[PDB]
Amino acid sequence: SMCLKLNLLDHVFANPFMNAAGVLCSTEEDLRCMTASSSGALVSKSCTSAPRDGNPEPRYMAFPLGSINSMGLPNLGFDFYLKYASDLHDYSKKPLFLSISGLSVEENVAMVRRLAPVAQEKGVLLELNLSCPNVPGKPQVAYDFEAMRTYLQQVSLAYGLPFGVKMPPYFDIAHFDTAAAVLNEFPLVKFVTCVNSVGNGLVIDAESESVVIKPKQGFGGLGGKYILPTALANVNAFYRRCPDKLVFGCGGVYSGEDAFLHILAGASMVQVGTALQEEGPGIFTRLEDELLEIMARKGYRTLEEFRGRVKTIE
Amino acid sequence: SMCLKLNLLDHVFANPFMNAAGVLCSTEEDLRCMTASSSGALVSKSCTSAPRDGNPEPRYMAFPLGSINSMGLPNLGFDFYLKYASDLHDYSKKPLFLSISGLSVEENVAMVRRLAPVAQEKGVLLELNLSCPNVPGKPQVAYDFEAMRTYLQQVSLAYGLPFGVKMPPYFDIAHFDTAAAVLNEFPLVKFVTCVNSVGNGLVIDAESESVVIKPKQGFGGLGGKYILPTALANVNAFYRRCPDKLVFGCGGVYSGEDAFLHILAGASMVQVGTALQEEGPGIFTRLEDELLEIMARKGYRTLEEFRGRVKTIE
């Protein structure tokens, strides 16, 4: 307890919290608001080479147990996020991650060669989003393990510097084994963020008898309380499988207790999506106070004392 | 006058509600208790050829948002559930489904060959569980589409009568498309039950810093409030893709409103797992009363007036 500062990836962080990609991070105003917050770090909205308007509205809805979204990758385009990283961000305040989600391997490769020099000069960190649009006859890249191994071979070659990868959840132990083995072929992959939204849920409103988002006939990715045990399982499964990488936890964090659980499961940073969208950036002071209170009550003075130390029975 | 009656698969059901396989259905006492309840049907515990003790305890835990289990297929063996179907079940009370979950294709074929004549004579209905290991280190059967196709070819040939399948949830539209395509190759697959538990979640208790079930280092399938939007998405995705089959909904039903949503999404029968494990069989009269109250408020007199009629935006 006392202070939550930590060191990772050759950067210093005041605390393990940050936003989850896509939440409060699309515009210059959003990035400045996350920088002014008490978060330890921030990450930009996943970007494409060109600006995109994204899907028709309504495209995000939240409820007491979490959220559903089909945003459609609305973003200001890579040139904007690169300019933010290279000219506007104040690195004295906290580290910045830039998320990129190009629609093809070649788009991703082209973005990463342009990011490399700014990464070298300013220390922006890459989070590569291994999620994708629906392509009939094909699964998202992180659910096609040979495709994933390609992206990553090309990005590693094009980029040449340490980066991390945002993963969808898996639900099968054979898939954890295969996915972690792919990631462990790439020494430049230094962190793994588990998880993106739980794909293609469906929220229906009983009174109106209607789905609640317009795109994809109401289907969208789930976040929030629905997904905490899924997120913890993925964090711990990759923590156990990838001893030479860091794991960042994302999914279902509304409280310092939920962050403590992610850290027990193995998380180094803890990302906040739905709860941050719903509460606003004040949440970061509350999460830090709540995490330090649980640490004090247990006698922990550092995150290292309990990271990955979830106990199993027998 | 409003009515919850259904007539499907050559049987008559007083109402759409039944247990989910595995809950309140392992012993003769459990089956007689389900038969005495107000449910419209019941299904037996997934069985294997030989009796199994299942995994060490604790292997099921529940919490306000749902449950986690790694039961390990504990069951009295096929001969016991076939005897209950042949000799003990009172068909004048309600229809019976028998769930089978052999650990290889050959074990499944051996069971269904022996079930067939009792299905024909007594009208017990088969639910084949495809959320079930085959070769260890490979995914569960229904996440391996080639294994799925083989199981269904082999069981269709061996059994020769209408049956249904219990599916795990999917999270990728390409997987909905592929999975429904595989099902639609089999005309004897007349119902599809969506969904089994969401696989390999991990619940951690913050005070003890421990996982809450003993098998698989705490990893287990999730049911209950966590999984309702996932369940609804799978029900509706298979309802849209399998127009010549029925869909039975399972996942996250605690109220008549949750059942109404399943039915809007396309469900015929509605199965209740976690909430029945937690509340007991009195839940069925509460779910019938709650569903009738929503139907009365909306002016609906039968389930067909709204099954599959979820509205999309635009």
Ligand SMILES: Cc1cc2nc3c(=O)[nH]c(=O)nc-3n(C[C@H](O)[C@H](O)[C@H](O)COP(=O)(O)O)c2cc1C
């Ligand atoms: C409105 C919204 C937009 C998101 N956009 C992205 C994104 O651009 N890139 C990405 O990696 N994940 C994105 N996500 C997923 C979140 O980063 C996060 O993985 C997910 O919401 C689970 O965390 P939570 O339970 O805290 O919400 C988005 C989530 C939401 C709710």
Ligand SMILES: Cc1cc2nc3c(=O)[nH]c(=O)nc-3n(C[C@H](O)[C@H](O)[C@H](O)COP(=O)(O)O)c2cc1C
């Ligand atoms: C204790 C337990 C045992 C289960 N055993 C089986 C089983 O034998 N066969 C099966 O198809 N599903 C089994 N399941 C899954 C349930 O049938 C159901 O698909 C899942 O719990 C989701 O429904 P719910 O949200 O109502 O719990 C079991 C679930 C629980 C909680």
Ligand SMILES: COC(=O)c1cccc2cc(CCCCc3c(C(=O)O)[nH]c(=O)[nH]c3=O)ccc12
């Ligand atoms: C109906 O068409 C789409 O939804 C779509 C079209 C073209 C590109 C897409 C690209 C995506 C990629 C999603 C990547 C960003 C993201 C989003 C988001 O921007 O929707 N939401 C998340 O929960 N996680 C994410 O990682 C999703 C949908 C589309």
Ligand SMILES: COC(=O)c1cccc2cc(CCCCc3c(C(=O)O)[nH]c(=O)[nH]c3=O)ccc12
């Ligand atoms: C420790 O190793 C295991 O978990 C295991 C070992 C041998 C056979 C198994 C068989 C299963 C098969 C699951 C089939 C029944 C079932 C169960 C159950 O009995 O665990 N729970 C569910 O939520 N859904 C189900 O469909 C699961 C685990 C094992």
Ligand SMILES: C[As](C)(=O)[O-]
């Ligand atoms: C705060 As926004 C509307 O740019 O995510």
Ligand SMILES: C[As](C)(=O)[O-]
């Ligand atoms: C393990 As203790 C010293 O944190 O009470």
Ligand SMILES: C[As](C)(=O)[O-]
């Ligand atoms: C009620 As029981 C322990 O036979 O599922």
Ligand SMILES: C[As](C)(=O)[O-]
């Ligand atoms: C008219 As129909 C319920 O068989 O698709």
